[PDB]
From a paper:
In pacidamycin 3, biosynthesis the 3′‐deoxy moiety is mediated by [name], an enzyme found to catalyze the key dehydration of uridine‐5′‐aldehyde 1 to form 3′‐deoxy‐3′,4′‐didehydrouridine‐5′‐aldehyde 2. In stark contrast to most characterised dehydratases, [name] is small (121 aa), monomeric, co‐factor independent and utilises a non‐activated nucleoside, rather than a free monosaccharide, as a substrate. [name] is the only monomeric, metal‐free cupin dehydratase characterised to date. We demonstrate here that the reaction most likely proceeds via an E1Cb mechanism, with H42 acting as an active site base, however, unlike many other dehydratases, no metal or cofactor is required for activity.
Initial soaks with uridine‐5′‐aldehyde 1, the natural substrate, were problematic due to both turnover and the inherent instability of this molecule. In order to overcome this problem we used substrate analogues, uridine 7 and uridine 5′‐uronic acid 8, which enabled us to obtain liganded complexes of the enzyme, providing the first clues of the location and structural determinants of the active site. Both ligands occupied the same binding pocket in their respective co‐crystal structures. Comparison of the apo‐ and ligand‐bound structures revealed that small movements in residues such as K16, F103 and L21 create a pocket that encloses the ribose ring of the substrate analogues but leave one side of the uracil group solvent exposed. Within the ribose pocket, the 5′ oxygen lies almost equidistant (2.5–2.7 Å) between Y55 and Y89, with a slightly shorter distance to Y89, whereas the 4′ proton and 3′ hydroxy are 2.7–3 Å from H42. In contrast to this extensive network of direct polar interactions the uracil ring makes a single H‐bond to K16 at the lip of the active site, with more Van der Waals (L21, V34, V99) and π‐stacking interactions (F103) characterising recognition of this part of the substrate. Notably, lipophilic residues L97 and V36 border the active site, creating a hydrophobic environment and perhaps sheltering the substrate or dehydrated product from attack from water. An E1cB mechanism can be postulated from the structure to be likely: in the first step, H42 could act as base extracting the activated 4′ proton, creating an enolate 10. The oxyanion could then be stabilised by hydrogen bonding by Y55 and Y89, and the protonated H42 could then act as the acid, donating a proton to 3′ hydroxy group of the substrate and thus generating a better leaving group.
Residue numbers in the entry: 1 to 121
Write the structure that this text describes.
Amino acid sequence: MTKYKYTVEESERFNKHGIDLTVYGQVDPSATVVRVSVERGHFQEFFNVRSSYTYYVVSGQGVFYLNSEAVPAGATDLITVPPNTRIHYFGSMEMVLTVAPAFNEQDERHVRFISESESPY
Ligand SMILES: O=c1ccn([C@@H]2O[C@H](CO)[C@@H](O)[C@H]2O)c(=O)[nH]1
Protein backbone atom coordinates (compact mmCIF):
# COMPACT_ATOMS: atom_id res chain seq x y z
CA MET A 1 0.00 0.00 0.00
CA THR A 2 2.79 2.47 0.86
CA LYS A 3 4.56 4.07 -2.13
CA TYR A 4 8.32 4.12 -1.55
CA LYS A 5 9.71 4.48 -5.08
CA TYR A 6 9.34 7.40 -7.48
CA THR A 7 10.63 7.25 -11.07
CA VAL A 8 11.65 9.77 -13.69
CA GLU A 9 9.02 8.33 -16.07
CA GLU A 10 6.22 9.21 -13.62
CA SER A 11 7.69 12.54 -12.57
CA GLU A 12 6.64 16.00 -13.66
CA ARG A 13 9.31 17.45 -15.93
CA PHE A 14 9.46 21.04 -17.08
CA ASN A 15 11.75 23.99 -17.78
CA LYS A 16 11.86 26.99 -15.43
CA HIS A 17 14.24 29.98 -15.84
CA GLY A 18 16.73 27.97 -17.94
CA ILE A 19 16.80 24.79 -15.83
CA ASP A 20 15.18 21.42 -16.47
CA LEU A 21 13.43 20.12 -13.35
CA THR A 22 12.38 16.59 -12.50
CA VAL A 23 9.84 16.75 -9.69
CA TYR A 24 9.20 13.19 -8.52
CA GLY A 25 6.10 14.08 -6.52
CA GLN A 26 7.42 13.21 -3.04
CA VAL A 27 5.08 14.40 -0.29
CA ASP A 28 6.74 14.66 3.11
CA PRO A 29 6.71 17.77 5.32
CA SER A 30 10.36 17.29 6.34
CA ALA A 31 11.93 17.57 2.86
CA THR A 32 11.48 17.05 -0.79
CA VAL A 33 14.07 16.01 -3.32
CA VAL A 34 14.18 16.85 -7.04
CA ARG A 35 16.62 16.67 -9.95
CA VAL A 36 17.95 19.83 -11.60
CA SER A 37 19.67 19.88 -14.98
CA VAL A 38 21.23 23.14 -16.18
CA GLU A 39 22.97 23.80 -19.50
CA ARG A 40 23.99 27.43 -19.02
CA GLY A 41 22.19 28.87 -16.00
CA HIS A 42 19.26 29.61 -13.74
CA PHE A 43 18.44 33.03 -15.18
CA GLN A 44 16.51 34.34 -12.20
CA GLU A 45 17.43 35.27 -8.65
CA PHE A 46 15.09 34.18 -5.88
CA PHE A 47 15.00 33.30 -2.21
CA ASN A 48 12.91 31.03 -0.02
CA VAL A 49 11.75 32.40 3.33
CA ARG A 50 11.30 28.99 5.02
CA SER A 51 13.47 26.28 3.43
CA SER A 52 17.15 25.43 3.06
CA TYR A 53 18.21 24.46 -0.49
CA THR A 54 20.96 21.82 -0.61
CA TYR A 55 22.41 21.08 -4.06
CA TYR A 56 24.50 17.95 -4.62
CA VAL A 57 26.44 18.27 -7.89
CA VAL A 58 26.33 14.91 -9.70
CA SER A 59 28.34 16.12 -12.67
CA GLY A 60 29.63 19.24 -14.39
CA GLN A 61 30.91 22.58 -13.19
CA GLY A 62 29.30 25.92 -12.36
CA VAL A 63 29.14 28.82 -9.94
CA PHE A 64 26.48 29.72 -7.39
CA TYR A 65 25.71 33.28 -6.35
CA LEU A 66 24.49 33.32 -2.77
CA ASN A 67 23.58 36.77 -1.50
CA SER A 68 25.70 37.90 -4.49
CA GLU A 69 28.76 35.93 -3.28
CA ALA A 70 30.34 33.65 -5.89
CA VAL A 71 30.70 30.00 -4.85
CA PRO A 72 32.38 27.75 -7.43
CA ALA A 73 30.88 24.28 -7.59
CA GLY A 74 31.86 21.04 -9.27
CA ALA A 75 31.12 17.35 -9.44
CA THR A 76 30.74 15.78 -5.94
CA ASP A 77 30.48 19.14 -4.11
CA LEU A 78 27.62 19.90 -1.77
CA ILE A 79 26.25 23.46 -1.81
CA THR A 80 24.24 24.25 1.33
CA VAL A 81 22.04 27.38 1.16
CA PRO A 82 20.20 28.50 4.31
CA PRO A 83 16.72 30.05 4.18
CA ASN A 84 16.30 33.69 3.19
CA THR A 85 19.40 33.66 0.98
CA ARG A 86 19.30 35.07 -2.55
CA ILE A 87 20.19 32.35 -5.09
CA HIS A 88 21.12 32.13 -8.71
CA TYR A 89 23.69 30.01 -10.53
CA PHE A 90 25.43 29.53 -13.85
CA GLY A 91 26.99 26.41 -15.28
CA SER A 92 26.59 23.11 -17.03
CA MET A 93 25.61 20.76 -14.21
CA GLU A 94 23.42 17.88 -13.15
CA MET A 95 22.29 18.17 -9.53
CA VAL A 96 20.09 16.63 -6.86
CA LEU A 97 18.34 19.32 -4.81
CA THR A 98 16.91 18.91 -1.33
CA VAL A 99 14.44 21.52 -0.08
CA ALA A 100 13.94 21.22 3.70
CA PRO A 101 11.19 21.81 5.04
CA ALA A 102 9.30 20.61 2.01
CA PHE A 103 9.22 22.93 -0.97
CA ASN A 104 6.21 25.24 -1.05
CA GLU A 105 6.00 27.67 -3.99
CA GLN A 106 4.34 30.22 -1.64
CA ASP A 107 7.65 30.50 0.26
CA GLU A 108 9.69 31.52 -2.77
CA ARG A 109 10.21 35.16 -3.72
CA HIS A 110 11.32 36.54 -7.09
CA VAL A 111 14.13 39.09 -6.93
CA ARG A 112 15.07 39.61 -10.59
CA PHE A 113 15.46 38.08 -14.00
CA ILE A 114 18.98 37.56 -15.34
CA SER A 115 20.09 38.03 -18.94
CA GLU A 116 21.27 34.81 -20.64
CA SER A 117 24.43 36.73 -21.70
CA GLU A 118 25.48 36.96 -18.03
CA SER A 119 26.38 33.25 -17.92
CA PRO A 120 29.88 32.51 -19.25
CA TYR A 121 28.88 28.89 -19.97
O1 LIG B 1 9.83 20.92 -5.82
C1 LIG B 1 10.53 21.81 -6.34
C2 LIG B 1 11.87 22.13 -5.96
C3 LIG B 1 12.52 23.11 -6.61
N1 LIG B 1 11.94 23.83 -7.64
C4 LIG B 1 12.67 24.90 -8.31
O2 LIG B 1 13.98 24.44 -8.56
C5 LIG B 1 14.87 25.58 -8.60
C6 LIG B 1 16.06 25.28 -7.71
O3 LIG B 1 17.16 26.08 -8.06
C7 LIG B 1 14.03 26.80 -8.22
O4 LIG B 1 13.60 27.47 -9.40
C8 LIG B 1 12.85 26.17 -7.48
O5 LIG B 1 11.68 26.98 -7.51
C9 LIG B 1 10.64 23.58 -8.04
O6 LIG B 1 10.09 24.22 -8.93
N2 LIG B 1 10.01 22.57 -7.36
